[PDB]
Motif scaffolding. Structure first.
Motif, PDB file in Angstrom:
ATOM      1  N   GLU A 158      -0.958   1.555  -6.269  1.00  0.00           N
ATOM      2  CA  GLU A 158      -0.637   0.175  -6.618  1.00  0.00           C
ATOM      3  C   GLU A 158      -0.974  -0.785  -5.482  1.00  0.00           C
ATOM      4  O   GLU A 158      -1.479  -1.888  -5.725  1.00  0.00           O
ATOM      5  CB  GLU A 158       0.838   0.066  -6.999  1.00  0.00           C
ATOM      6  CG  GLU A 158       1.328  -1.355  -7.177  1.00  0.00           C
ATOM      7  CD  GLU A 158       2.808  -1.425  -7.481  1.00  0.00           C
ATOM      8  OE1 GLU A 158       3.251  -0.759  -8.439  1.00  0.00           O
ATOM      9  OE2 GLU A 158       3.529  -2.141  -6.752  1.00  0.00           O
ATOM     10  N   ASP A 159      -0.701  -0.391  -4.235  1.00  0.00           N
ATOM     11  CA  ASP A 159      -1.022  -1.258  -3.104  1.00  0.00           C
ATOM     12  C   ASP A 159      -2.528  -1.429  -2.949  1.00  0.00           C
ATOM     13  O   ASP A 159      -3.005  -2.532  -2.653  1.00  0.00           O
ATOM     14  CB  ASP A 159      -0.416  -0.701  -1.816  1.00  0.00           C
ATOM     15  CG  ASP A 159       1.085  -0.892  -1.745  1.00  0.00           C
ATOM     16  OD1 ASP A 159       1.617  -1.742  -2.489  1.00  0.00           O
ATOM     17  OD2 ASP A 159       1.733  -0.197  -0.935  1.00  0.00           O
ATOM     18  N   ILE A 160      -3.289  -0.350  -3.140  1.00  0.00           N
ATOM     19  CA  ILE A 160      -4.742  -0.428  -3.010  1.00  0.00           C
ATOM     20  C   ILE A 160      -5.324  -1.347  -4.075  1.00  0.00           C
ATOM     21  O   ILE A 160      -6.189  -2.182  -3.790  1.00  0.00           O
ATOM     22  CB  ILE A 160      -5.361   0.981  -3.081  1.00  0.00           C
ATOM     23  CG1 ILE A 160      -4.945   1.808  -1.864  1.00  0.00           C
ATOM     24  CG2 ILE A 160      -6.877   0.894  -3.182  1.00  0.00           C
ATOM     25  CD1 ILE A 160      -5.368   3.262  -1.940  1.00  0.00           C
ATOM     26  N   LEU A 161      -4.849  -1.219  -5.318  1.00  0.00           N
ATOM     27  CA  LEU A 161      -5.414  -2.013  -6.403  1.00  0.00           C
ATOM     28  C   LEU A 161      -5.015  -3.481  -6.303  1.00  0.00           C
ATOM     29  O   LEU A 161      -5.771  -4.355  -6.743  1.00  0.00           O
ATOM     30  CB  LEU A 161      -4.997  -1.424  -7.750  1.00  0.00           C
ATOM     31  CG  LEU A 161      -5.634  -0.067  -8.059  1.00  0.00           C
ATOM     32  CD1 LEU A 161      -4.976   0.591  -9.265  1.00  0.00           C
ATOM     33  CD2 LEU A 161      -7.137  -0.225  -8.277  1.00  0.00           C
ATOM     34  N   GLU A 162      -3.846  -3.777  -5.731  1.00  0.00           N
ATOM     35  CA  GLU A 162      -3.470  -5.173  -5.529  1.00  0.00           C
ATOM     36  C   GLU A 162      -4.317  -5.818  -4.436  1.00  0.00           C
ATOM     37  O   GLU A 162      -4.697  -6.990  -4.548  1.00  0.00           O
ATOM     38  CB  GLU A 162      -1.983  -5.280  -5.190  1.00  0.00           C
ATOM     39  CG  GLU A 162      -1.055  -4.992  -6.364  1.00  0.00           C
ATOM     40  CD  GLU A 162      -1.260  -5.951  -7.517  1.00  0.00           C
ATOM     41  OE1 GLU A 162      -1.247  -7.177  -7.282  1.00  0.00           O
ATOM     42  OE2 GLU A 162      -1.441  -5.481  -8.659  1.00  0.00           O
ATOM     43  N   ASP A 163      -4.625  -5.068  -3.373  1.00  0.00           N
ATOM     44  CA  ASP A 163      -5.474  -5.604  -2.315  1.00  0.00           C
ATOM     45  C   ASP A 163      -6.921  -5.745  -2.773  1.00  0.00           C
ATOM     46  O   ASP A 163      -7.623  -6.660  -2.328  1.00  0.00           O
ATOM     47  CB  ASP A 163      -5.390  -4.717  -1.071  1.00  0.00           C
ATOM     48  CG  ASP A 163      -6.168  -5.285   0.105  1.00  0.00           C
ATOM     49  OD1 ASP A 163      -5.765  -6.343   0.632  1.00  0.00           O
ATOM     50  OD2 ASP A 163      -7.176  -4.669   0.510  1.00  0.00           O
ATOM     51  N   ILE A 164      -7.385  -4.858  -3.657  1.00  0.00           N
ATOM     52  CA  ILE A 164      -8.746  -4.971  -4.175  1.00  0.00           C
ATOM     53  C   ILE A 164      -8.900  -6.252  -4.984  1.00  0.00           C
ATOM     54  O   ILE A 164      -9.827  -7.039  -4.759  1.00  0.00           O
ATOM     55  CB  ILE A 164      -9.114  -3.726  -5.006  1.00  0.00           C
ATOM     56  CG1 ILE A 164      -9.286  -2.509  -4.096  1.00  0.00           C
ATOM     57  CG2 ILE A 164     -10.389  -3.971  -5.799  1.00  0.00           C
ATOM     58  CD1 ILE A 164      -9.589  -1.226  -4.841  1.00  0.00           C
TER      59      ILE A 164
END
Ligand SMILES: [K+]
Ligand SMILES: [K+]
Ligand SMILES: [K+]
Ligand SMILES: [K+]
Ligand SMILES: [K+]
Ligand SMILES: [K+]
Ligand SMILES: [K+]
Ligand SMILES: [K+]
Ligand SMILES: [K+]
Ligand SMILES: [K+]
Ligand SMILES: [K+]
Ligand SMILES: [Mg+2]
Ligand SMILES: [Mg+2]
Ligand SMILES: [Mg+2]
Length: 1319
Positions: free
Chosen positions: A605-611
């Motif tokens: 979830e953190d990776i996809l929000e930063d992407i």
RNA sequence: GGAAAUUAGGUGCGCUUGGCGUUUUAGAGCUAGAAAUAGCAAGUUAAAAUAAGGCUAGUCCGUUAUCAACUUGAAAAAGUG
DNA sequence: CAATCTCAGCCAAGCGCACCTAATTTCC
DNA sequence: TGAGATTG
């Protein structure tokens, strides 16, 4: 006790004070100054007038232009510095001669021939290179070592005029169709096309419209039609965009355009729907478009030269020379006595005016076309003209199509040729290419260093920024992030948290669950409808939202309640047709990464929000790739390539910390947690943050401008915002006038092209593929007519009948309102259509009937898809199939005619309310001493017409003040009669509400004939029901209003303003021996170089001093009005005496200098008044106080078109003598204060000529005659069809001995200065 | 009176860019004639400026907003009928 | 002097954010 | 609608 009425407009603020008897008071006000008069009596009613406030847009466009001229200069300076040392060896003054090329020979410091410094070499250069494009072409192709000065000029010309940056990537010109045909014939082996003999080069690159070229190409392909697949593809290679729905028997519309960034995605959309076997067909279309992309600008074979652009200009030059020799020989042989006008007279639009005069190419063609058609042998010349390709210049208006890659190609080629001989050209080749190609990113802004209020850029290193070190010196990452972050909203609930990107996965989970959690379902056997549980909502999300981009109700019933819940029938509430929210980004990323498990894993979830944050924050694909490579190991390199192309724009309304960060203390659940599962309550976002049993509300609470700044930051036109601040200042002064006592009430009322119209029709007709513009061409100015504008917005068809309209029969057609104007007050295009007969709409009660909708809904859809009608218009057209206008709908419309709902008007009420009411009671509740009442204009407007208090705007400016007075009268009386209405009008069943608001103003009338055909009677004295307070006496209160509107003394004040803006008119006129022209640079004497005309006076100053006279220069005392121009203002204000002495004045009386801005008021003899238009011209300063009987007479006499109109018509007949009495009012007034006897005689003469004309027509044209007497600048007017030109007062001498009047904002406080005592 | 979502249309503020125009100069005008002129030839291009300019000297800033008078105060402001 | 005529920088591209109005669903 | 030039 008193109330204040206010009328806020774009150029006026009307105001009035009233008592509880609706009277306007009068007071004696002190008069300051040095005159006889110590005091004066004034009525407490008037209007402030002011020039329109301006937006900042023009200032912004000029600021941009300045930066670009500065930076264009620096591009040349960059190039010259590179050439500096080596040019000093060839010609040590070459760059000097270029800089002083503008100077006359006498002012030049070097030889007058710039390139070579002597006439023989200079003449020889132009002989060999008549245009710069000859030199550019030569330096690209030739292998010889060239003169370094000629190399510079070619490179400088490309760098100075470098072409646009609308095409990303590299371009390499290279001039196939037989392959694409062979490709289509393979993918469609059963239906092949034969293009043998088809000249694909000549048909497609021809100059005509692409719609005609498409027809020309298809004409050569028998058995193929234009709307066939191959025909639709031809536009894709050409550059247009057609629809392939019927080609592939599709259900949804699908279009393709090669130049768009979404082509590969829409091609993936179409190919995934029709089959990958069609890839080679769009592949051969893309391969063909590369060679024919520049066919509009590159009209030259690319194998013969590496400079096809310059070769194309030489082609223009050569054909110009050939065709000019032809044209001269023809005219000499056939029309000899017209040769002088064509080739010598610059004032005519012939060839002389085309080359030397001011004739454009378009004006030259219009002038010469009839000459060509009259003569023989002009066959090819006529074809070139109608192709707009005759006798063309090289620097022309249509060169904007040239991309910078084309100029870069020739620049690079010259560098490659000449770097073999000049080592510095090799060592600086990429440096020179960088000067041409470098473009400051818009997300970086001005390259400032702490002295620009517009800049946000930050530097990695403290050093000068050049095009070559930009990436190293400028911190592009931090600058691009600052660019966005300084503008994006913070979460109002958590004011220190930035809002999420609109396309964030978490944000869209929030929107879907917030909507899903309020859905209810009920089936046969259930006692009552039930919420969806957490397991049911998750099941619906996994099964429907994560597998379909949109989720319809039918899918919910069939693909969940049937398959999972095993319900045959089920009723759904909380969603109609389909869910509004959706997981758009989830399906975007699913197609890119092709890993559903990755998307569903909460660990990611953190990776996809930063992407998504990176994709939203940045626009540059390379910066995006840079910021994404922390996750590069997670995805295939092919996936990363598609991930960097997936860009998003837009930000949400809430932060991540709010929706899924803060936790309820007792439960430990975030807001999104509750939306996913909240027992059997299913509290949504609003319920969760307002629930006292949760800790969200208290945590949001614990997380929580001057007057001018506040008003400036309001949304709305800066025009209306000017009146808002002036309104507050008027109120402040009135309260001070009333002994600092605050009023009981304040009643406020706020008042309610051809370029865009041609664009909407061009884009709309192109979307429809209609040929109406070819059959009936128009100009942008013709579309100002609303009937002709509706004709093209409807593709020349009737909106209510499926039939064509006649363009020459528009006078017989009707313009009908979609929603009847008896219910709503909309007269815009969004509520009007053009029909043959309005009776074909159906009934007049409602929206167009169902039968019309059933017949025209499909036709209306095509207009909606072409943007020819809006969605709001389409929804109003089709409202019959949704029940039409309900009884509630009619009550709301009539309510919105009374209750003002504009946000800007509520802000004015809030501003005045929070300034008047400042005290709090024992419960800390605000004490509303002053009631701020808001009214709509229709309320007082109907009050005028119902009780014969008519308004004629052209007579004078009193109507602004009368409007404010009637606002106060109607507003206070309404709240007095019905105090319950305070919730609607004071800041701080359905048929019954319709009838209530329809008869809310009935208490003013004595006899009332309502809509139901009945007569009601009300007493002369209207009172409030609860109290005994009398609110309206229909005998004395109307007479009081009549006495107010007839008072001749009204305080009309034109706001004096220093003039700002441009120094002068922008035109650079040719040299003249006058002293009126202004130098364009310090040492550019306009006698030699021309310059600017008409400087703008910022303000005038009164000067009492002495001036030298004669050769003896003897001193003579003078008193003069001196205009201080905008350009002079800073110097004059820095030291006024030294400025005035530099103007020639001596012994200036320093303390007698008076600053006199525009509209400064002066009174002379017999009450005549003047306002300063400048230092040398005056404006009219008086108001014609026409008696009320004449104002009402002109209103009724000019508006001839219930049966009681006979009583109104009769009154006009019995008072026909008012026409001559009004002319005498105008004559006596004009002879007293206007002093324009030449125009006045022409007025009285024109009036006597048309005394036979009908009384209505005479009354209409008499209204025009008040232009002679109006306040302000003189203006021309016409009486019937006699035009009377304006009489300007182009002398300010008389005001130097008149009485100067300084007025406060209300005009109640005056200081009068007798200027005759000065001298 | 508010909030989020959906659909559509508007407005404001800000940034980065393209093409013209205009101005002065350069692109040898020729022949006849004392001259006034007349008969021809020629024309497409470029440089430079595009608010004067400013200091803070940046590839920065220079046209929006705001402004009766008087008094005390340089200025900001406050006060006066 | 006056009366009268004459004149006014324009066209285009891309991008960002923030507001507003107006219809719909759900809520405070 | 300010203001430069031309005509009366
Ligand atoms: K010289
Ligand atoms: K055909
Ligand atoms: K010209
Ligand atoms: K021209
Ligand atoms: K030009
Ligand atoms: K819906
Ligand atoms: K983006
Ligand atoms: K990888
Ligand atoms: K201003
Ligand atoms: K202005
Ligand atoms: K004033
Ligand atoms: Mg430019
Ligand atoms: Mg400059
Ligand atoms: Mg140019």
């Amino acid at each position: 006790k008193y109330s204040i009425g206010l009328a806020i407009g774009t150029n006026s603020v009307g105001w009035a004070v009233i008592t509880d008897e609706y009277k306007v008071p009068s007071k004696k006000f002190k008069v300051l100054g040095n005159t006889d008069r110590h005091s004066i009596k004034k009525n407490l009613i008037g209007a402030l007038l002011f020039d329109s406030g301006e937006t900042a847009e023009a200032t912004r466009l000029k600021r941009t232009a300045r930066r670009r001229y500065t930076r264009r200069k620096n591009r040349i300076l960059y190039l010259q510095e590179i050439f500096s040392n080596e040019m000093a060896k060839v010609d040590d003054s070459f760059f000097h001669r270029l800089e002083e090329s503008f100077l006359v020979e006498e002012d030049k410091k070097h030889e007058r021939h710039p390139i070579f410094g002597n006439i023989v070499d200079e003449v020889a250069y132009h002989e060999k290179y008549p245009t710069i494009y000859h030199l550019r072409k030569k330096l690209v192709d030739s292998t010889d070592k060239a003169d370094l000065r000629l190399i510079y000029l070619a490179l400088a010309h490309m760098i100075k005029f470098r072409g646009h940056f609308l095409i990303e990537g590299d371009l390499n010109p290279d001039n196939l169709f037989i392959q694409l045909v062979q490709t289509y014939n393979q993918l469609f082996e059963e239906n092949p096309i034969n293009a043998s003999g088809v000249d694909a080069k000549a048909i497609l690159s021809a100059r005509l419209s692409k719609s005609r070229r498409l027809e020309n190409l298809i004409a050569q392909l028998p058995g193929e039609k234009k709307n066939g697949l191959f025909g639709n593809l031809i536009a894709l290679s050409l550059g247009l965009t057609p629809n392939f729905k019927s080609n592939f028997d599709l259900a949804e519309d699908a279009k393709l355009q090669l130049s768009k960034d979404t082509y590969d995605d829409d091609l993936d959309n179409l190919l995934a729907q029709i089959g990958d076997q069609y890839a080679d067909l769009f592949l051969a279309a893309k391969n063909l478009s590369d060679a024919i992309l520049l066919s509009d600008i590159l009209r030259v074979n690319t194998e013969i030269t590496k400079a096809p652009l310059s070769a194309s200009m030489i082609k223009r030059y050569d054909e110009h020379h050939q065709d000019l020799t032809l044209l001269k020989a023809l005219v000499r042989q056939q029309l000899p006595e017209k040769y002088k006008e064509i080739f010598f007279d610059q004032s005519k639009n012939g060839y002389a005016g085309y080359i030397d005069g001011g004739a454009s190419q378009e004006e030259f063609y219009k002038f010469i076309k009839p000459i060509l058609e009259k003569m023989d042998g002009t066959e090819e010349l006529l074809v070139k003209l109608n192709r707009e390709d005759l006798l063309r210049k090289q620097r022309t208006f249509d060169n904007g199509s040239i991309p910078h890659q084309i100029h870069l190609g020739e620049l690079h080629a010259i560098l490659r040729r000449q770097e073999d001989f000049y080592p510095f050209l090799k060592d600086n080749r990429e440096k020179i290419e960088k000067i041409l190609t470098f473009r400051i990113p818009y997300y970086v802004g001005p390259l400032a260093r702490g002295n620009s209020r517009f800049a946000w850029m930050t530097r990695k290193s403290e050093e000068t920024i050049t095009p070559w070190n930009f990436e190293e010196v400028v911190d592009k990452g931090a600058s691009a992030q600052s660019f966005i972050e300084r503008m994006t909203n913070f979460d109002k609930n958590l004011p220190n948290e930035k809002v999420l990107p609109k396309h964030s996965l978490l944000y869209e989970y929030f929107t879907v669950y917030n909507e899903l959690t309020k859905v209810k379902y009920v089936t046969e056997g259930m006692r009552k409808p039930a919420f969806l549980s957490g397991e049911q909502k998750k099941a619906i999300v996994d099964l429907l939202f994560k597998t379909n981009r949109k989720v319809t109700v039918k899918q919910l019933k069939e693909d969940y309640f049937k398959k999972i819940e095993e319900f045959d029938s089920v009723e759904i509430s909380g969603v109609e047709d389909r869910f509004n929210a959706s997981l758009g980004t989830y399906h975007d990323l699913l197609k890119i990464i092709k890993d559903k498990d990755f998307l569903d894993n909460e660990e990611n979830e953190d990776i996809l929000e930063d992407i998504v944050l990176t994709l939203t924050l940045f626009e540059d694909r390379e910066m995006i790739e840079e910021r994404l490579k922390t996750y590069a190991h997670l995805f295939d390199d092919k996936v990363m390539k598609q991930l960097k192309r997936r860009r998003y724009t837009g930000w949400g309304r809430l932060s991540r910390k709010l929706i899924n960060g803060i936790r309820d203390k007792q439960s430990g659940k975030t807001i999104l947690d509750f939306l996913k599962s909240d027992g059997f309550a299913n509290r949504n976002f609003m319920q969760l943050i307002h629930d006292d049993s949760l800790t969200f509300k208290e945590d949001i609470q614990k997380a929580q401008d001057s007057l001018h700044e506040h008003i400036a930051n309001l949304a709305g036109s800066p025009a209306i915002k000017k009146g808002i601040l002036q309104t507050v200042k008027v109120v402040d002064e009135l309260v001070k006038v009333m002994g600092r006592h605050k009023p009981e009430n304040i009643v406020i009322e706020m008042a309610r092209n051809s370029r865009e119209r041609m664009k909407r029709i061009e884009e709309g007709i192109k979307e429809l593929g209609s040929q109406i513009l070819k059959e009936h061409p128009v100009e942008n100015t013709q579309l100002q007519n609303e009937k002709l504008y509706l004709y093209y917005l409807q593709n020349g068809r009737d909106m209510y009948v499926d039939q064509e309209l006649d363009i020459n029969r528009l006078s017989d057609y009707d313009v009908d309102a979609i929603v009847p104007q008896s219910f709503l007050k909309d007269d815009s295009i969004d509520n009007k259509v053009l029909t043959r007969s309005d009776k074909n709409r159906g009934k007049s009660d409602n929206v167009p009937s169902e039968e019309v909708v059933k017949k025209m809904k499909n036709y209306w859809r095509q207009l909606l898809n072409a943007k020819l009608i809006t969605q709001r218009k389409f929804d109003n057209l089709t409202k019959a199939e949704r029940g039409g206008l309900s009884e509630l709908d009619k009550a709301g419309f009539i309510k919105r005619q009374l209750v003002e709902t504009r946000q800007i008007t509520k802000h004015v009420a809030q501003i005045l309310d929070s300034r008047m009411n400042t005290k709090y009671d024992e419960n800390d509740k605000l004490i509303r001493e002053v009631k701020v009442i808001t009214l709509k204009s229709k309320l007082v407007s109907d009050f005028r017409k119902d009780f014969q208090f008519y308004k004629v705007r052209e007579i004078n400016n009193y109507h602004h003040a009368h409007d404010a007075y009637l606002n106060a009268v109607v507003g206070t009386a309404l709240i007095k009669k019905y105090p319950k209405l305070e919730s609607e009008f004071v800041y701080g069943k359905a048929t019954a509400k319709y009838f209530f608001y329809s008869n809310i103003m009935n208490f003013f009338k004595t006899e009332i004939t309502l809509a139901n055909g009945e007569i009601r009677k009300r007493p002369l004295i209207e009172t409030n029901g609860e109290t005994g307070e009398i609110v309206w006496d229909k005998g004395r209160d109307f007479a009081t209003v009549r006495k107010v509107l007839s008072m001749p003394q009204v305080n009309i004040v034109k706001k004096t303003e220093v003039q700002t803006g441009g120094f002068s008119k922008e035109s650079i006129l040719p040299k003249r021996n006058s002293d009126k022209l202004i130098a364009r640079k310090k040492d550019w004497d306009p006698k030699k170089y021309g310059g600017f005309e008409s400087p703008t006076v910022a303000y005038s100053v009164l000067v009492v001093a002495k001036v030298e006279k004669g050769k003896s220069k003897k001193l003579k005392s003078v008193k003069e009005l001196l205009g201080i121009t905008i350009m002079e203002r800073s110097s004059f204000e820095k030291n006024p005496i030294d400025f005035l002495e530099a103007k020639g004045y001596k012994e200036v009386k320093k303390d007698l200098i008076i600053k006199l801005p525009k509209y400064s008021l002066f009174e002379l003899e017999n009450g005549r008044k003047r306002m300063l238009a400048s230092a040398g011209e005056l404006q009219k300063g008086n108001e014609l106080a026409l008696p009320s009987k004449y104002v009402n007479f002109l209103y009724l006499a000019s508006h001839y078109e219930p049966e009681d109109n006979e009583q109104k018509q009769l009154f006009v007949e019995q008072h026909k003598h008012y026409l001559d009495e009004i002319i005498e009012q105008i004559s006596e007034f004009s002879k007293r204060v206007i002093l324009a006897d030449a125009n006045l005689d022409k007025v009285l003469s024109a009036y006597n000529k048309h005394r036979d004309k009908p009384i209505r027509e005479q009354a209409e044209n008499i209204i025009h005659l008040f232009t002679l007497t109006n306040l302000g600048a003189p203006a021309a007017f016409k009486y019937f069809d006699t035009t009377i030109d304006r009489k300007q007062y182009r002398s300010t001498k008389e005001v130097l001995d008149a009485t100067l009047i300084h007025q406060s904002i209300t005009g109640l406080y005056e200081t009068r200065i007798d200027l005759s005592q000065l001298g």
